[PDB]
Amino acid sequence: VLSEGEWQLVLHVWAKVEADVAGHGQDIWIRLFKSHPETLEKFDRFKHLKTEAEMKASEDLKKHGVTVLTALGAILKKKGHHEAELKPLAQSHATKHKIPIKYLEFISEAIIHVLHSRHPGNFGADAQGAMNKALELFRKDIAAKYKELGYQG
Ligand code: HEM
């Protein structure tokens, strides 16, 4: 469980992210796909992108980034009360997409890296600690659901 103070640090930097969701979405995707190329193989819709240049030019990838960050933003705003939001997300990623927990760790690392680069003033050590805790909470809960749904992860 996070304290209200930790949630405040998380929502304060997220408010900056919301000033440009599409842009943050792109940086995160490109960071992830370059650092862990294996994750790209999970998207039959994007697996054909070969360079950073092609990724940045993809309108579909941009749109998808917005969908993903909007869903994550909805979860963070719940401040730990996200049971309802996690069920459909867990079912699709465990049953249809088959995304192991390891990949959720990779995208978590990408989010922290992008926020550190674009918002140093609102992402000091304490804020990063709060965001890491919020993302670990998210992963822990998704993992528990995975098990209940019959997927190891
Ligand atoms: C921050 C964590 C994540 C969130 C909040 C999230 C959210 C979403 C949402 C909302 C969708 C569309 C609706 C749905 O299918 O449920 C989606 C689709 C998908 N996600 Fe995620 N996702 C996350 C992480 C990942 C990761 C790490 C991978 C793979 C390495 C992944 C793979 C997929 C795939 C393959 C689709 C289908 C894309 C398509 O063909 O249109 N997701 N995700």
Side-chain angles (χ1 to χ4, degrees):
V1 181
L2 281 71
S3 63
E4 176 62 29
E6 298 178 313
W7 280 119
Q8 286 293 294
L9 294 179
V10 169
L11 289 313
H12 184 50
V13 63
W14 196 258
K16 305 301 173 180
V17 176
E18 299 189 317
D20 177 24
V21 62
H24 284 76
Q26 285 183 301
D27 291 347
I28 289 165
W29 281 144
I30 290 180
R31 174 63 185 188
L32 172 68
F33 293 147
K34 293 305 177 183
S35 296
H36 302 281
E38 64 262 43
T39 59
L40 184 50
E41 287 298 68
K42 310 310 294 290
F43 303 81
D44 306 315
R45 193 152 67 111
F46 309 125
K47 69 195 305 175
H48 65 294
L49 304 176
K50 302 174 177 296
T51 62
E52 186 180 311
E54 306 197 316
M55 294 176 185
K56 209 166 184 178
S58 173
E59 197 75 312
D60 282 322
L61 182 60
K62 184 181 184 186
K63 296 176 172 296
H64 189 64
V66 172
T67 303
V68 171
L69 291 188
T70 299
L72 179 63
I75 292 172
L76 296 174
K77 290 177 181 180
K78 283 297 185 181
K79 300 183 180 179
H81 303 280
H82 53 226
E83 312 70 52
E85 288 62 47
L86 290 196
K87 289 200 295 179
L89 196 71
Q91 178 172 48
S92 69
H93 289 59
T95 314
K96 187 186 183 184
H97 315 316
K98 299 184 177 298
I99 310 306
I101 298 299
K102 186 183 189 184
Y103 287 15
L104 294 179
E105 288 177 45
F106 294 156
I107 195 175
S108 288
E109 168 189 55
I111 288 170
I112 289 168
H113 180 283
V114 168
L115 296 183
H116 181 263
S117 297
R118 294 181 63 150
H119 308 291
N122 293 304
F123 208 67
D126 295 324
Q128 187 175 319
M131 182 62 82
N132 177 57
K133 191 170 179 180
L135 290 175
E136 300 200 319
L137 175 73
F138 166 70
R139 295 200 302 276
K140 175 181 178 300
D141 284 350
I142 286 289
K145 246 54 188 64
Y146 266 19
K147 189 175 186 303
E148 290 170 49
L149 293 166
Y151 180 60
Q152 181 180 57

